[PDB]
Design a protein around this motif. Structure first.
Motif, PDB file in Angstrom:
ATOM      1  N   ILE A  21      53.501  42.800  24.672  1.00  0.00           N
ATOM      2  CA  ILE A  21      52.132  43.253  24.471  1.00  0.00           C
ATOM      3  C   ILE A  21      52.242  44.516  23.619  1.00  0.00           C
ATOM      4  CG2 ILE A  21      50.054  44.198  25.591  1.00  0.00           C
ATOM      5  CD1 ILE A  21      50.594  42.075  27.856  1.00  0.00           C
ATOM      6  N   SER A  22      51.554  44.510  22.474  1.00  0.00           N
ATOM      7  CA  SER A  22      51.650  45.541  21.431  1.00  0.00           C
ATOM      8  C   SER A  22      51.328  46.944  21.912  1.00  0.00           C
ATOM      9  CB  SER A  22      50.709  45.195  20.257  1.00  0.00           C
ATOM     10  N   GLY A  23      50.335  47.059  22.786  1.00  0.00           N
ATOM     11  CA  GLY A  23      49.749  48.360  23.094  1.00  0.00           C
ATOM     12  C   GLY A  23      48.826  48.833  21.974  1.00  0.00           C
ATOM     13  N   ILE A  58      51.917  41.146  32.160  1.00  0.00           N
ATOM     14  CA  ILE A  58      53.359  41.258  31.889  1.00  0.00           C
ATOM     15  C   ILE A  58      54.190  40.189  32.587  1.00  0.00           C
ATOM     16  CG2 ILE A  58      53.309  43.773  31.360  1.00  0.00           C
ATOM     17  CD1 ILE A  58      54.908  43.977  34.281  1.00  0.00           C
ATOM     18  N   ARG A  59      53.617  39.577  33.625  1.00  0.00           N
ATOM     19  CA  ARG A  59      54.285  38.471  34.344  1.00  0.00           C
ATOM     20  C   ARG A  59      53.301  37.314  34.555  1.00  0.00           C
ATOM     21  NH1 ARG A  59      55.817  43.011  37.879  1.00  0.00           N
ATOM     22  NH2 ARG A  59      57.895  43.746  37.189  1.00  0.00           N
ATOM     23  N   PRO A  60      53.025  36.530  33.490  1.00  0.00           N
ATOM     24  CA  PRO A  60      51.994  35.470  33.552  1.00  0.00           C
ATOM     25  C   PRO A  60      52.266  34.417  34.639  1.00  0.00           C
ATOM     26  CG  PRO A  60      52.805  35.746  31.287  1.00  0.00           C
ATOM     27  CD  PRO A  60      53.674  36.609  32.167  1.00  0.00           C
ATOM     28  N   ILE A 115      46.872  46.191  25.748  1.00  0.00           N
ATOM     29  CA  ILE A 115      47.820  47.035  26.497  1.00  0.00           C
ATOM     30  C   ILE A 115      48.382  46.319  27.723  1.00  0.00           C
ATOM     31  CG2 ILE A 115      46.810  49.156  25.580  1.00  0.00           C
ATOM     32  CD1 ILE A 115      45.684  49.541  28.556  1.00  0.00           C
ATOM     33  N   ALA A 116      49.559  46.753  28.167  1.00  0.00           N
ATOM     34  CA  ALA A 116      50.348  46.004  29.161  1.00  0.00           C
ATOM     35  C   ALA A 116      49.916  46.176  30.624  1.00  0.00           C
ATOM     36  CB  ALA A 116      51.817  46.316  28.989  1.00  0.00           C
ATOM     37  N   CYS A 117      48.681  45.775  30.925  1.00  0.00           N
ATOM     38  CA  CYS A 117      48.093  45.948  32.266  1.00  0.00           C
ATOM     39  C   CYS A 117      46.792  45.167  32.327  1.00  0.00           C
ATOM     40  CB  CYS A 117      47.850  47.417  32.621  1.00  0.00           C
ATOM     41  SG  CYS A 117      47.376  48.487  31.239  1.00  0.00           S
ATOM     42  N   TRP A 174      52.650  51.284  27.499  1.00  0.00           N
ATOM     43  CA  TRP A 174      51.426  50.599  27.046  1.00  0.00           C
ATOM     44  C   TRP A 174      51.794  49.396  26.151  1.00  0.00           C
ATOM     45  CZ3 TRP A 174      48.422  52.195  30.574  1.00  0.00           C
ATOM     46  CH2 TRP A 174      48.296  53.562  30.912  1.00  0.00           C
ATOM     47  N   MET A 175      52.904  49.540  25.423  1.00  0.00           N
ATOM     48  CA  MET A 175      53.634  48.418  24.815  1.00  0.00           C
ATOM     49  C   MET A 175      54.702  48.028  25.837  1.00  0.00           C
ATOM     50  SD  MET A 175      56.906  47.737  23.523  1.00  0.00           S
ATOM     51  CE  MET A 175      57.537  46.171  22.884  1.00  0.00           C
TER      52      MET A 175
END
Length: 341
Positions: A43-45, A254-256, A50-52, A26-27
């Motif tokens: 991304i902190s979570g 996560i992959r801009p 969160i990372a999604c 999530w981080m």
């Protein structure tokens, strides 16, 4: 009502502060564009950041939480999906809690568990053999341990990173470290990127192949128009083709830089077209990318409407949180009607 020829890709790498000591997955770091330098971030979570690109109905859950595992298994019941293929990261995964819980909860309802051998550090023919040995010895006797044609089934992610002549030492009958006709034998499924590289499956002495990628056209092999032909190859070479179907794709959190891989769900239409093409190919097994690979936005797991300060998440609106689970059950049913007992 559980189909044992339908296999989801399941991820047990999630964690939260109160179960695991910290946010896990999530981080997540934000990936640099291929070839570029930087310290682009993470991304902190934290604070619902969160990372999604979607937000789970179960929130920032832990894969080590028995209640989550119970609910994930129930979600598979709803989808009619009988088999979960759990992500496996090598020696660091030996004896991991989440796997034992998964097997124990699956066995209560008749679900089954197989393993998805990831590209872990130091992965080689030798270390893959050691891991097959560990999984077979440790989990092989469990009631929920997956078998088909009387044999365990293994998926091997990024298998092309090891050359096919190296795989043959492990998978050829006469190979120097062969598992063939030992208690460690099974059905080993390699990742294929293109129909023209299918002979690599033959040279590697693998038993079959899968496509993995949920994004149509991302590879030649994840282009559904090629699937009927891929099935014909498998059939003529005594191999198992297992197409991978997904509901959509997006990983831009996560992959801009990776917007070119994005595939819109189109209110279920994308899933429908891809699952249809899998069934019509004639394949005997269908794999689903994914149950819960949240980073890549391929999850069929329930998602909800959500906004934080940093981000407004995509969601399944105006469809239900469980839309993709219910629609999976629909497609599993179509698959069974296309195959009979």
């Amino acid at each position: 009502t559980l189909d044992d020829h339908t296999i989801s890709f399941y991820y047990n790498w999630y964690g939260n502060p109160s179960v695991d000591g910290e946010m896990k997955h999530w981080m997540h770091p934000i990936a640099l564009a291929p070839g570029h330098s930087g310290d682009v971030g993470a991304i902190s979570g934290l604070n619902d950041d969160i990372a999604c690109n979607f937000y789970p109905e179960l929130g920032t859950y832990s894969s080590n939480d028995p209640e989550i595992i119970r609910k994930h298994i129930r979600m598979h019941i709803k989808a009619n999906v009988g088999v979960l293929s759990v992500t496996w990261w090598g020696e660091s995964d030996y004896g991991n809690q989440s796997v034992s819980l998964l097997l124990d909860e699956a066995a209560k309802v008749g679900a089954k568990v197989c393993f998805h051998i990831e590209p872990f550090n130091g992965r080689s023919p030798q270390t893959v053999r050691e891991n097959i040995q560990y999984i077979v010895d440790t989990y092989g006797d469990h009631p929920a341990f997956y078998r088909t044609h009387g044999k365990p089934l293994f998926f091997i992610y990024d298998s092309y990173l090891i050359k096919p002549a190296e795989w043959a030492k492990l998978f050829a009958a006469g190979g120097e470290i062969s598992v063939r006709n030992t208690k460690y034998d099974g059905l080993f499924i390699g990742l294929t990127l293109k129909e023209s590289e299918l002979p690599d499956i033959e040279t590697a002495c693998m038993d079959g192949f899968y496509t993995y990628f949920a994004a149509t056209g991302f590879t030649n092999a994840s282009t559904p128009a090629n699937w009927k032909s891929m099935q014909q190859w498998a059939k003529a070479h005594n191999k198992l083709f297992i197409p991978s179907v997904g509901p959509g794709y997006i990983d831009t959190r996560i992959r801009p830089w990776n917007g070119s891989t994005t595939r819109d769900r189109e209110n279920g239409k994308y899933y429908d077209d891809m699952y249809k093409a899998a069934i019509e190919s004639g394949a005997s097994y269908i794999s689903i990318t994914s149950f819960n690979e949240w980073h890549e936005g391929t999850q069929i797991e329930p998602a909800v409407s959500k906004k934080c300060d940093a981000f407004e998440y995509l969601d399944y609106k105006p469809l239900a949180d469980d839309y993709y689970l219910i629609r999976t059950a629909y497609w599993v049913d179509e698959f069974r009607k296309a195959r009979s007992a």
